[PDB]
Amino acid sequence: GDIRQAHCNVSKATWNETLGKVVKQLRKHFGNNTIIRFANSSGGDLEV
Amino acid sequence: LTQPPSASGSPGQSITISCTGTSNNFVSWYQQHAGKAPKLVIYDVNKRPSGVPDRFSGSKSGNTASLTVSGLQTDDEAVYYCGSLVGNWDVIFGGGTKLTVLGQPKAAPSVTLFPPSSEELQANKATLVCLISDFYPGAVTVAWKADSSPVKAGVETTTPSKQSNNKYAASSYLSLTPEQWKSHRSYSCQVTHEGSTVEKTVAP
Amino acid sequence: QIINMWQRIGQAMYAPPIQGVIRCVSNITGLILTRDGGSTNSTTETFRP
Amino acid sequence: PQLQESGPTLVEASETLSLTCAVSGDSTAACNSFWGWVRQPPGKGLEWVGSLSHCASYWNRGWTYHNPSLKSRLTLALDTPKNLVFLKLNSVTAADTATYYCARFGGEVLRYTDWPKPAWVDLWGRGTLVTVSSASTKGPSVFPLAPSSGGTAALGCLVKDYFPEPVTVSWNSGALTSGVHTFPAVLQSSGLYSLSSVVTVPSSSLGTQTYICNVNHKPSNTKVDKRVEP
Ligand SMILES: *[C@@H]1O[C@H](CO)[C@@H](O[C@@H]2O[C@H](CO)[C@@H](O[C@@H]3O[C@H](CO[C@H]4O[C@H](CO[C@H]5O[C@H](CO)[C@@H](O)[C@H](O)[C@@H]5O[C@H]5O[C@H](CO)[C@@H](O)[C@H](O)[C@@H]5O)[C@@H](O)[C@H](O[C@H]5O[C@H](CO)[C@@H](O)[C@H](O)[C@@H]5O)[C@@H]4O)[C@@H](O)[C@H](O[C@H]4O[C@H](CO)[C@@H](O)[C@H](O)[C@@H]4O[C@H]4O[C@H](CO)[C@@H](O)[C@H](O)[C@@H]4O[C@H]4O[C@H](CO)[C@@H](O)[C@H](O)[C@@H]4O)[C@@H]3O)[C@H](O)[C@H]2NC(C)=O)[C@H](O)[C@H]1NC(C)=O
Ligand SMILES: *[C@@H]1O[C@H](CO)[C@@H](O[C@@H]2O[C@H](CO)[C@@H](O[C@@H]3O[C@H](CO[C@H]4O[C@H](CO[C@H]5O[C@H](CO)[C@@H](O)[C@H](O)[C@@H]5O)[C@@H](O)[C@H](O[C@H]5O[C@H](CO)[C@@H](O)[C@H](O)[C@@H]5O)[C@@H]4O)[C@@H](O)[C@H](O[C@H]4O[C@H](CO)[C@@H](O)[C@H](O)[C@@H]4O[C@H]4O[C@H](CO)[C@@H](O)[C@H](O)[C@@H]4O[C@H]4O[C@H](CO)[C@@H](O)[C@H](O)[C@@H]4O)[C@@H]3O)[C@H](O)[C@H]2NC(C)=O)[C@H](O)[C@H]1NC(C)=O
Ligand SMILES: *[C@@H]1O[C@H](CO)[C@@H](O[C@@H]2O[C@H](CO)[C@@H](O[C@@H]3O[C@H](CO[C@H]4O[C@H](CO)[C@@H](O)[C@H](O)[C@@H]4O)[C@@H](O)[C@H](O[C@H]4O[C@H](CO)[C@@H](O)[C@H](O)[C@@H]4O[C@H]4O[C@H](CO)[C@@H](O)[C@H](O)[C@@H]4O[C@H]4O[C@H](CO)[C@@H](O)[C@H](O)[C@@H]4O)[C@@H]3O)[C@H](O)[C@H]2NC(C)=O)[C@H](O)[C@H]1NC(C)=O
Ligand SMILES: *[C@@H]1O[C@H](CO)[C@@H](O[C@@H]2O[C@H](CO)[C@@H](O[C@@H]3O[C@H](CO)[C@@H](O)[C@H](O[C@H]4O[C@H](CO)[C@@H](O)[C@H](O)[C@@H]4O[C@H]4O[C@H](CO)[C@@H](O)[C@H](O)[C@@H]4O)[C@@H]3O)[C@H](O)[C@H]2NC(C)=O)[C@H](O)[C@H]1NC(C)=O
Ligand SMILES: *[C@@H]1O[C@H](CO)[C@@H](O[C@@H]2O[C@H](CO)[C@@H](O[C@@H]3O[C@H](CO)[C@@H](O)[C@H](O)[C@@H]3O)[C@H](O)[C@H]2NC(C)=O)[C@H](O)[C@H]1NC(C)=O
Ligand SMILES: *[C@@H]1O[C@H](CO)[C@@H](O[C@@H]2O[C@H](CO)[C@@H](O[C@@H]3O[C@H](CO)[C@@H](O)[C@H](O)[C@@H]3O)[C@H](O)[C@H]2NC(C)=O)[C@H](O)[C@H]1NC(C)=O
Ligand SMILES: *[C@@H]1O[C@H](CO)[C@@H](O[C@@H]2O[C@H](CO)[C@@H](O)[C@H](O)[C@H]2NC(C)=O)[C@H](O)[C@H]1NC(C)=O
Ligand SMILES: *[C@@H]1O[C@H](CO)[C@@H](O)[C@H](O)[C@H]1NC(C)=O
């Protein structure tokens, strides 16, 4: 079949909308105005 | 794909036939004996299949693909087609190259052109027939002209066939209306054999 | 195919191969997140899975 | 591995051409190759028809490739259990008259990237000739060819539209052997057949001595002799 590596799909519009709604909820704690940056896993076991 | 119309060689000599229009490596060549089915003699450029002699080798340089047959023999006389994958999944074939390993000796073709008859014109039909014979190799292209300008309509040309004297022969049939036959005085028939051409002309 | 989840030692499971192409659709209903310790607490905050 | 083509060798114009290939020694289920057809019109080059394969991926139930020109009028089909290949051509014309070969396509079929890529036919069939005609059995129209070189000229007899083959043309009923020639048949755009003959005779023989060819056609029941004069 296809010579490919396994892949996972996420729709750009749907993930973004949630992020925008979620990032506002963190500001009910971390303060009205602040910069929230997202980043991938730090490091560890593969499961992590 | 553009494949040369003809190719000739003596037994033991090496022949190289080309093909152009191949941008990929999917190039493949085929061998079809007259009155038989085509057989694949090469694939994936140079690579050979089962039961195929070492003397068949594929090659591709730039946009040009090439087949090479060394040590010619009787069984090598056939029509050779090339083909390759193009675009997404489509595949095309060349016009094919006719390679002949016939006995000696080489000779210029011979043309005899016959204008429509009087009885034929009575049926409101006009047909001119070019008879080409006694040529080597066995592949010839035929062209038609009226006075000066060429004739692209009504042209029927057939693959040549070997004769009793071992010389190949072919016939092209031009069918048109009697109106255009009487209007245009002379009708020329051009027969191209290995670069050199042989011409005939008829007028009522 | 060979996995030890839940930090299990002494037992490793081999996931058997599956005939054909596997396709699956699931809902993503939530996340597991961590906050960085580097602070600069009053400046900005970064979150990671 | 053997490919056996089967179906009608004679079909009428504008109708549906159907042909079926029977494979032996291999499975149509096998994902190593594609199955399709390649047609070769009489005295012409090889033209690709199409091929398909049920061996699919996650977004399709298979793959099917059609030649852009023949796409509208053709349908390709594979029977996996019965190991058979099918070809159906709608609205067929005498231009579609060809020797159809059952073709097995090799290439990047067993290990491809994105879509599968078939490029060459490794295994052929013997093939069958399908002739498309809008008419029935017809008798040939005979017209004489009047000559004019080199001390001895050439004259012949013209054999016009007929069907089916063969036709035997002899000069003076086998009176002359040396210097006698006959050209093969030609398929017309109207689905019919045509050919001719030629003989070389001295100019000194021109006179009360004339030449007559004997035409013979078994299917249409035609025996016609015609004298040739310049
Ligand atoms: C995660 O997300 C990923 C996205 O980020 C996602 O990837 C996407 O996956 C889906 C499927 O999962 C993909 O969708 C498929 O794409 C296939 C390939 O599409 C490409 O190719 C076609 C064809 O292009 C040729 O033909 C046209 C028309 O002639 C020409 O205009 C082209 O220039 C080109 O022509 C060359 O080739 C010809 C043939 O060799 C030559 O004759 C010619 O001379 C040229 O050399 C293009 O149309 C596509 O363009 C489209 O997409 C681009 C993207 O940039 C747009 O810009 C553009 O505007 C177009 O929208 C593209 O380039 C499709 O073939 C496939 O559709 C087929 O299958 C469906 C199944 O339902 C059928 O309904 C449909 O009709 C198609 O069937 C035909 O094709 C199949 C084989 O694919 C045959 O089996 C079938 O019988 C039928 O063939 C017939 O038609 C053929 C012409 O189409 C003809 O050649 C045959 O002979 C026969 O008659 C489907 O849409 C999608 O592309 C992926 N996208 C990306 C970005 O990766 C991933 O899946 C996600 N992951 C998961 C897990 O979900
Ligand atoms: C991934 O790769 C794999 C390959 O590794 C791909 O798998 C292949 O997929 C194709 C497509 O489905 C399969 O073809 C189907 O075949 C079945 C019959 O299968 C049985 O018989 C096969 C042949 O056996 C013979 O040959 C072998 C080899 O020589 C020989 O050893 C054997 O003794 C025997 O002589 C077997 O190969 C096959 O084995 C497979 O399955 C086993 C489990 O059953 C498994 O253990 C094996 O390892 C192997 O994988 C099996 O025994 C056909 O019935 C079927 O035809 C229907 O389905 C297709 C779509 O799948 C459809 O297009 C057809 O039109 C047809 O559908 C009609 O008929 C159905 C009933 O027959 C009916 O239910 C449908 O509703 C439909 O009917 C309607 O429409 C028709 C018109 O279409 C109409 O007339 C009706 O009235 C009605 O309206 C397929 O052709 C291959 O078998 C399969 N395997 C291989 C090895 O190729 C796979 O596709 C790839 N992709 C994905 C995503 O997985
Ligand atoms: C979170 O939740 C979501 C949603 O609940 C979960 O998604 C679920 O994922 C399941 C798979 O893990 C999936 O189960 C599938 O159900 C499909 C539908 O079944 C119904 O329809 C059929 C008719 O098609 C009915 O007969 C049946 O009774 C049901 O009513 C099945 O079609 C699926 O089978 C196929 O997929 C699985 C893997 O997903 C294969 O193991 C299986 O063999 C099947 O794959 C074959 O068939 C497809 C075509 O159908 C081929 O494309 C494919 O290549 C395979 O074909 C080859 O292999 C078979 C043998 O395997 C062979 O016979 C054949 O000839 C070929 O060789 C599967 O049963 C749930 O439906 C799905 N949920 C929903 C709502 O759809 C998600 O997993 C959850 N998340 C987690 C983490 O669990
Ligand atoms: C993960 O996978 C899932 C499943 O594949 C994805 O969810 C699917 O997303 C697709 C596209 O986003 C969506 O497909 C459309 O569904 C519509 C119904 O909801 C269909 O109507 C539509 O079909 C038309 O378009 C196709 C492609 O252009 C044509 O092939 C088809 O014939 C249709 O065209 C018709 O309709 C027009 C008028 O609209 C008419 O003029 C034509 O004549 C013809 O009749 C699409 O197929 C699926 O519905 C989604 N599935 C689900 C369950 O939601 C998801 O997006 C994937 N996620 C990621 C991140 O990749
Ligand atoms: C990320 O989320 C934002 C919303 O916060 C998405 O912006 C959306 O962009 C589309 C255009 O691509 C907007 O549609 C537009 O609608 C207006 C009004 O009908 C129309 O005038 C435009 O022509 C266009 O159709 C959409 O309204 C907008 N969202 C909101 C809430 O306004 C963005 O699309 C998301 N990311 C991605 C992947 O685009
Ligand atoms: C999460 O995303 C980050 C950002 O891309 C990934 O970090 C990347 O890690 C690779 C190592 O696997 C880095 O390659 C390294 O490049 C440097 C500079 O050339 C070189 O000195 C090293 O020898 C190595 O080649 C890569 O640079 C780095 N990305 C960046 C932007 O620096 C990280 O891997 C991702 N995490 C996971 C789990 O995927
Ligand atoms: C993912 O979410 C969707 C929507 O919440 C689920 O689909 C719903 O299923 C219920 C079952 O009773 C229906 O009543 C709803 O109508 C469905 N939604 C829509 C929009 O129609 C879906 O089931 C969820 N995923 C899983 C795996 O269950
Ligand atoms: C946060 O916002 C609320 C109103 O949304 C306001 O009353 C409060 O003063 C703000 N806190 C700040 C800016 O620190």
Side-chain angles (χ1 to χ4, degrees), chain B residues 30 32 38 88 93 163 173, chain D residues 40 46 115 121 124 181 183 196:
Chain B
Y30 297 82
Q32 182 178 228
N88 291 28
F93 293 83
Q163 301 170 72
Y173 287 67
Chain D
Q40 181 180 254
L46 292 167
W115 69 80
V121 181
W124 293 76
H181 201 284
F183 276 80
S196 59

Side-chain angles (χ1 to χ4, degrees), chain C residues 18-27, chain D residues 56-61:
Chain C
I18 307 299
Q19 188 81 16
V21 180
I22 303 184
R23 61 182 296 176
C24 67
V25 173
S26 303
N27 299 8
Chain D
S57 62
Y58 56 88
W59 74 85
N60 49 35
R61 293 182 182 174

